[PDB]
Amino acid sequence: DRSRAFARDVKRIVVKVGTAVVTGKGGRLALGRLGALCEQLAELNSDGFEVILVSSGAVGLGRQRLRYRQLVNSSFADLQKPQTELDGKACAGVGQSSLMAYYETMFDQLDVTAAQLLVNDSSFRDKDFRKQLNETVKSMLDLRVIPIFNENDAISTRSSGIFWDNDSLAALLALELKADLLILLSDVEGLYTGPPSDPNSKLIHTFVKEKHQDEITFGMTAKVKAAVNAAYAGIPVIITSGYSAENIDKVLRGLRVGTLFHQDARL
Amino acid sequence: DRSRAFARDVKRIVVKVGTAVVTGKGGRLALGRLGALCEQLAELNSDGFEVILVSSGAVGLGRQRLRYRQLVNSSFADLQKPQTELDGKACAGVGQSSLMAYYETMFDQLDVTAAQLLVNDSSFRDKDFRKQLNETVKSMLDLRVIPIFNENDAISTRSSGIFWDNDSLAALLALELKADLLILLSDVEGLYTGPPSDPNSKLIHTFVKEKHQDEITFGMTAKVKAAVNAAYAGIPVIITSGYSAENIDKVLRGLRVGTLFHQDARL
Amino acid sequence: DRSRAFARDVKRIVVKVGTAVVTGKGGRLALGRLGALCEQLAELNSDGFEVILVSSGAVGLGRQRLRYRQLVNSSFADLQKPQTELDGKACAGVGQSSLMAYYETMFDQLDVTAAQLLVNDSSFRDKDFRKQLNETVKSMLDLRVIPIFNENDAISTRSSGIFWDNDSLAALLALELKADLLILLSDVEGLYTGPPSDPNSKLIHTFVKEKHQDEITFGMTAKVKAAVNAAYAGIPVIITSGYSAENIDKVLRGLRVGTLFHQDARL
Amino acid sequence: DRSRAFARDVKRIVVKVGTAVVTGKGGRLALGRLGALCEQLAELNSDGFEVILVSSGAVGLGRQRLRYRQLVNSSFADLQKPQTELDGKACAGVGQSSLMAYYETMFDQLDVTAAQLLVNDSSFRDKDFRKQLNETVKSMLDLRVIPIFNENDAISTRSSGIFWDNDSLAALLALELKADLLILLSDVEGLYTGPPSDPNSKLIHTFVKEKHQDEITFGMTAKVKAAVNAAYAGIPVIITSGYSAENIDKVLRGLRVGTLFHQDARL
Amino acid sequence: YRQLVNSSFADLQKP
Amino acid sequence: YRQLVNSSFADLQKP
Amino acid sequence: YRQLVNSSFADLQKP
Amino acid sequence: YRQLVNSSFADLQKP
């Protein structure tokens, strides 16, 4: 439109992928969605953008793999007994490795080098750590590498910290790395006036902190809170659906797509 | 022999792979050596052992990949100008992802699930962190998963800490996880009475803290220091060459292979 | 509709993928499209269908890879001289291996075993060969395997034969294997009353050999000829666009999608 | 020695890998052996040689995979009933795709482009086919590509033909492609004066058609017959053990390794 | 028991 | 029966 | 000449 | 200059 004109000076993008975008039916990987996303990110990176990817959704794939392992090495007599709940940290550790190995496979097939950085909550308490991370990211972006961040859930001792979920980790990274636009890839077209299943609900062209502030009932509430916190500091935030392969290009070209969170746009 | 009789009650093994074992000629991956090692580890894990792998050697592969990227996207005129030194943290971050993606590929091809855990020096300062890592590792080993540890060099702010290198990280993990035998995979057959190139040098059947204490001149000195620290606390340590595919089986069967670091054996 | 009611007793499907569906921009693989197609085929195969895939589009990927190789091992002075045209058979041979390795990678990641069969024109001249191939395909389908046929372009001595292109190889296989529905995955929504770029053109609900026989003007003419030949013998043929991930489900459910080629439907 | 001096003008090498070299314990892939072989072949190809690889051993891996599939999708009640023998052609078709996908994976990781050509017995009956294949192989070798031949067992209607096994397919290719040395990678160090298990047996430095001709009792008899047929026409043949990673370099450097089949050397 | 006896490995891999 | 009842999936994956 | 001298490897990888 | 002009991409990929 006219209020999405900042999509022309955008140089660094922090793209966060949701769990509903990574894991498909049955808990396995969604190969089509992730492949289209990786193709779009490689095209953006070849174009001249500096793309930072904050991956998410390792707990689900990890749990699927660990259930497979239990079955394969389990025995009938046992399958007749009750089941147990698979540890959370074990699932996260198993899923992270598979997800990032798959990311490396497709990025290599796309002729793009991808790098894996893992940052915990206790690490962010040091300003010197922030400076190091900034220097490392700058050096990796100067060679056209896509840093794939995440949260070290497989070692976390864990809300009271700086960040508690990837919805907020993306905002913290975008604020720290001085990004220019933050895209929260979810499974919904954006932010609605009510529940998505409600027919009376309507899409939000842009979020207003004086009108749409208290007009929506909510998960997505954490996404909205992180978006408001990020857009308050001067980082425009776009909530868009990752089910489509051209949404990133549409928002980066200035089209009316997704929900916009901007401090200057809101009046 | 007779003093390597503890290789029968061994149940948990902490295997550390060196940089000279992972990276082959040209800085690329050594596919033959790593493939043989992965085959042996899968056979051990299927046998009934609980194998913990402490990988190493991501800085070299990472630097090779980053030099490739610089060239591919570099331009002639530039190749005519002087070169620069690639950041250390960028190289480590790029190399780690590729190494562990390759590990996942071969372990999947071997029908074994491998898990990636990353632990930094600042994390070990918390006893509660030690308890949570122990619980996670126990839960992952109860499902026949090979936890592939490493050091988060791609985020490490960095000798004054608990551990400073993987030679000592392996010892710290073995002491904390209550392992039963620690194998330091290097490129040399063990510990010699002098430099390996010296013809007069002889292999050390077992390390004695009263005789071979100062009979050796030295890298490998860090390996020996970590081995002495680990074997002091009651964890037997074996330094063996990873160039062969059956060395792990030989040491685990009680044969005379490698250099032994034992507190009870030494007199 | 009412004339697509045969999509309920369909048990065997012969799916042919076009070149415009496999190769994306720059001659590289289209990862999103092929990933969505592989996900859909794995879902169909798990559902209870017997899916036969007749792949295509190795010449393009092969040529891209061979140009990469020429450059990488080529030298400046040479790049200053004129270029040459890369052999056709060399390109086909290089591309086939990469395409089918990628197919195996995604099918393994999808927990489906895929098999590669290659059949040439000279082989089809033997009736005993037809019986052998039928027996092999039956044995492979009884174990829930997806036979990935193709044409041995890398050994072909080469129109006068039984089949000359994959558009006709799919029809020959469907007739020989007694399939029940043949889907020709192309990049267009189907068959139009004229050129697709013509605004006055309209989609064809079903092809009539007494009306649309000569009305349509035209590549796609080979597709239409193969479709008419297949549908004459009693194998219903559907021409549908592979750019969407749910077109196969839509045609298999009886919805109005694509262009239909049926001998009984046409009047 | 002195009679292995022809290893200096060697320019094209036809390397045949046995079944005992590809498939490891349990019918799965031998990752260490194949990785070392691929590393050696990539080093040779980078050196300046023109390496042709005639792969073998898809029936075993294929049968393992098909048994896995039967079990996974089989059901207890059924496992209680008798088993069946898995078709030969289905096993070959499934195994070939996996083997060559793995070959592509390691060759890509080694920065070498590998190409897959499949040739049947009926195809060799045409001289024009021989010319076509020679032209294709020349064009593929001029771009530093490793053509990975095999036998189309998944389509073969099938001894009365030109070739019946890969031991003889390698000889036929070496004679047709005008190779300079043929290496038959087996699991034994070469040709012995008797059974390998016999302690009195001794290794044969070179095969003599007037002495060793009837001094050996025997599988390996097919290997010896193919070697004699190839070496009669003027192609030196070396039978060497593929269990070691440096045997190819040793024979190509002129060292005394393996068993030699030469028409000029024999007196 | 019967649900497991008359079941297959892939059926179990599901919830 | 018992060999199968008191067996595991990976044991079967072997001859 | 100049087009090649002031060019990069990835630019060439394209037609 | 000459070392680069009369060189290939893979030669550079080495120290």
Ligand SMILES: Nc1ncnc2c1ncn2[C@@H]1O[C@H](COP(=O)(O)OP(=O)(O)OP(=O)(O)O)[C@@H](O)[C@H]1O
């Ligand atoms: N008003 C609302 N509008 C849209 N979505 C809503 C709303 N209220 C709840 N939701 C839910 O919030 C979900 C947000 O998606 P998702 O599960 O990826 O969120 P998340 O908690 O940010 O994810 P992740 O675990 O990847 O960080 C939607 O899929 C939808 O089901």
Ligand SMILES: Nc1ncnc2c1ncn2[C@@H]1O[C@H](COP(=O)(O)OP(=O)(O)OP(=O)(O)O)[C@@H](O)[C@H]1O
């Ligand atoms: N007396 C000695 N005996 C054996 N090796 C020695 C000796 N002195 C020095 N070395 C060197 O120490 C090296 C130890 O191998 P390596 O490079 O893997 O060590 P590291 O510093 O522990 O490795 P990493 O970086 O993987 O932790 C040997 O390769 C050898 O060159």
Ligand SMILES: Nc1ncnc2c1ncn2[C@@H]1O[C@H](COP(=O)(O)OP(=O)(O)OP(=O)(O)O)[C@@H](O)[C@H]1O
């Ligand atoms: N009337 C028409 N309607 C639709 N497409 C047409 C028409 N005339 C020509 N075409 C062209 O035919 C093409 C058919 O697609 P495609 O290139 O895959 O065909 P193909 O020759 O069957 O492919 P392949 O090489 O994979 O066998 C369309 O992409 C379109 O550009």
Ligand SMILES: Nc1ncnc2c1ncn2[C@@H]1O[C@H](COP(=O)(O)OP(=O)(O)OP(=O)(O)O)[C@@H](O)[C@H]1O
């Ligand atoms: N006198 C002998 N010397 C050596 N090996 C012998 C002898 N007699 C029989 N053999 C057997 O021949 C085998 C040859 O190996 P291999 O199984 O690869 O043969 P092949 O039939 O040529 O293989 P492939 O199926 O790969 O073509 C040896 O492993 C050995 O067991």
